[PDB]
Amino acid sequence: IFSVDKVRADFPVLSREVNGLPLAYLDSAASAQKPSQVIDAEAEFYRHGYAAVHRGIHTLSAQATEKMENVRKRASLFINARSAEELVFVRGTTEGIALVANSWGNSNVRAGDNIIISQMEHHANIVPWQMLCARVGAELRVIPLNPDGTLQLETLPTLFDEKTRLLAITHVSNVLGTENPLAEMITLAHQHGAKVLVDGAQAVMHHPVDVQALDCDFYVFSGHKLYGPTGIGILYVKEALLQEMPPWEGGGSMIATVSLSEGTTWTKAPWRFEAGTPNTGGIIGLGAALEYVSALGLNNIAEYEQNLMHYALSQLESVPDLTLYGPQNRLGVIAFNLGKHHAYDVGSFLDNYGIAVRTGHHCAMPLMAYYNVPAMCRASLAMYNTHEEVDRLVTGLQRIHRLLG
Amino acid sequence: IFSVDKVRADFPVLSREVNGLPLAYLDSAASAQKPSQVIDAEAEFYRHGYAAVHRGIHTLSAQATEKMENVRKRASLFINARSAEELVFVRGTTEGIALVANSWGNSNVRAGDNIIISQMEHHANIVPWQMLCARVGAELRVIPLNPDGTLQLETLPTLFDEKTRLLAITHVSNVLGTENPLAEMITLAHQHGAKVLVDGAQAVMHHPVDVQALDCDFYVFSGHKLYGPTGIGILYVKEALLQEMPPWEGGGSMIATVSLSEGTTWTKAPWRFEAGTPNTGGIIGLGAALEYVSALGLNNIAEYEQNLMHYALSQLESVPDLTLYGPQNRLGVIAFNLGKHHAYDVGSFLDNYGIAVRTGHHCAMPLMAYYNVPAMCRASLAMYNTHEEVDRLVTGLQRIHRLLG
Ligand SMILES: *Cc1c(COP(=O)(O)O)cnc(C)c1O
Ligand SMILES: *Cc1c(COP(=O)(O)O)cnc(C)c1O
Ligand SMILES: [Cl-]
Ligand SMILES: [Cl-]
């Protein structure tokens, strides 16, 4: 069984005080706190084994190159990719999606084609496709939402056709906590020869993820949401696709040869898309984060978080004039507004009690617009959050409602 | 005065053993070791103040946003930019140059124009321009080299004309240690209305850099070469230029608004070019690295390194059949080959003695080709290297020459 007290003791930030009160960090969906196992792994690398990593001749460089490729292997096993060489290190989910849209998009999406996104997508999974569609003259289609925060799947027959090149879809909504039916949607997309990119930035920390079972063509996620360092993400691409992708004009690609007369050639994928000095510190920390999470067990984490979520939704029923957004079976986040008060004011009061939530449009303005609100509040309930922190959130909202209503 | 023993005691890697022998790290031009002040600043941030940073409502987020903007201010003072808002955080020098070539290049370089690079450029300051020139149908012109590793300045009249849009030039060669006459070249470029991008990745750790005095239009450098963390670089752009640059299609740009019907708008520069979650860990560490280097004083560092370089070049005269490449007044690096032996073999023997040098083409294949060699060895002499490590290098080359000659 999972022991939240043993886990919390690994996270030094959770001791912190904010406004003279004990921190209740409910904003892990924006970024997760990191255990000392992650922080110290990165520091230890800088302290005892740091070097540049392009299979340099000397020992530190060779050993650091091997550390980085072992992390690539560990990450591929974490998401059950067939091969470590199907994983590209990227700056984060945002850059990973941009890479696909520029390298794969520019040579597979032509004038008259269409791309399907959903109305709940984070901006990082909208804007690259908007721009691509403008470049090549294709059409961006949108799966609409239901009031309960799920996709209107009945609209799919009107969106998928033979010119559909790509479905770009979120695994788990960063606002609603909706988990989308990826395996079925991927079957539909592949029946039309469409690829699927899955934005998995909110999924990989909540339960096991198996890209072979899903059969998705691309999958992205962010280190810093996975209790890991900033500046590092993972992009998975099916080997047959990845080995056809051209070099990344926009972000830089690693060369095989450079000639002023004869031009330039490029090294094989993965590494083709990792130009310049990689973020070795971040890669080391990401590896430690994958080990930490695997050691707790994602199924134990999921069971604890689901129980915590069920407790919170039950307790929140006693908050007057609370509006919740999203389905009952949400993962990780609770999106809400309190009566007619602006989310910004609710979040400031909650911060005044030492409760960290996020306010605003959460990089999902089309989602905001669907619900005809400018902003919502969002509380994250991660593996190190407690029933007691849920009770502070509930009491906090009750007090805010009396003081301001 | 500078005390190399007091400085070395700040760097924990320098205690390390390699192949059972004490490390002599002479590969700082590939990446620098980091002091504990840098390592611990990053760890301390993760331990006590970590949060997401997009001016979030709650305290940790607000305080982390302010930490990151103070580092931007500190970096702008470090290079004497007029305004902190002229600095963009980037993944590294490679990504910074790609950003300029894609955002500024695509809307200022048209068919029939030309760009001037030099023959000693690192690949990161060649390939983006090669691709841009192919996109828009412009011409890539090259300032050639002299045998001593300096630019043939007499060729400039034949390269600069009214269609010259940009000069992209290295401040200090990562292979030869040549320092280029930037201020004079920038005057010439501006007489034709050409902009200048300076690749300063090898300059910022060796002496003060003043972008107002230089009057360059762009300037880039890498954190990890500045005794700082990986995954972070600085791109400086003159405010009038930067505020005109369009969003970065290839790498992602931060939105002001996203609408599925009305399209997308973008936030003001700096931040326009920092999409997704920034590398907050790396930014914090970079700030500590700038403080550490400022506390030693760049002029003291320069005086120590110059003395160390002069000692090494004097000692190396006693190595039979040593070929050196570059001018006598080189900064930081010594590029060399030993008789007819492949650089790879020399580097392996040196590594066997615990001496870390770099071998290969050093991401400067046109430079290699100018000298009609496939590879060279390169020893870096940074601020924490000693006369004794120079003596190990010299003795090592002498032994290699007897064993293999
Ligand atoms: C946060 C998030 C992103 C963006 O991730 P970055 O690490 O900031 O690049 C994209 N999609 C979802 C669903 C997210 O939650
Ligand atoms: C190392 C270096 C680069 C590339 O820097 P990255 O940090 O790897 O992106 C570019 N130019 C010069 C002169 C360099 O030494
Ligand atoms: Cl956004
Ligand atoms: Cl290269």
Numbering used by the authors:
A (entry chain A), B (entry chain A): 2 to 406
The authors write:
SufS is a pyridoxal-5′-phosphate–dependent enzyme that uses cysteine to generate alanine and an active-site persulfide (C364-S-S-). The SufS persulfide is protected from external oxidants/reductants and requires the transpersulfurase, SufE, to accept the persulfide to complete the SufS catalytic cycle. The β-latch contains four key components: the α6 helix, a glycine-rich loop, a β-hairpin, and a cis-proline. R92 and E96 (E. coli numbering) form cross-dimer electrostatic interactions with the α6 helix of the adjacent monomer, and N99 forms hydrogen bonds to the backbone amide and carbonyl of G251 in the glycine-rich loop.
We generated variants of SufS with either alanine or aspartate at position N99 and solved the crystal structures of the resulting proteins. Alteration of N99 results in significant, but localized, perturbations in components of the β-latch structural element. The structure of N99A SufS has continuous electron density for the β-latch; however, the glycine-rich loop and β-hairpin are shifted, exposing the SufS active site to solvent. In contrast to N99D, the N99A SufS structure does not show disruption of the cross-dimer interactions between R92 and E96. In the N99A SufS structure density for the glycine-rich loop and the β-hairpin is seen, suggesting they are less dynamic and are still capable of physically blocking the active site from solvent. However, the glycine-rich loop is in an altered conformation compared with the WT SufS structure. This altered conformation shifts the position of the S254 amide away from the active site by over 8 Å. The backbone amide of S254 has been shown to interact with the terminal sulfur of the C364 persulfide in the outward-facing position. Loss of this interaction could affect the stability of the persulfide intermediate to nucleophilic attack.
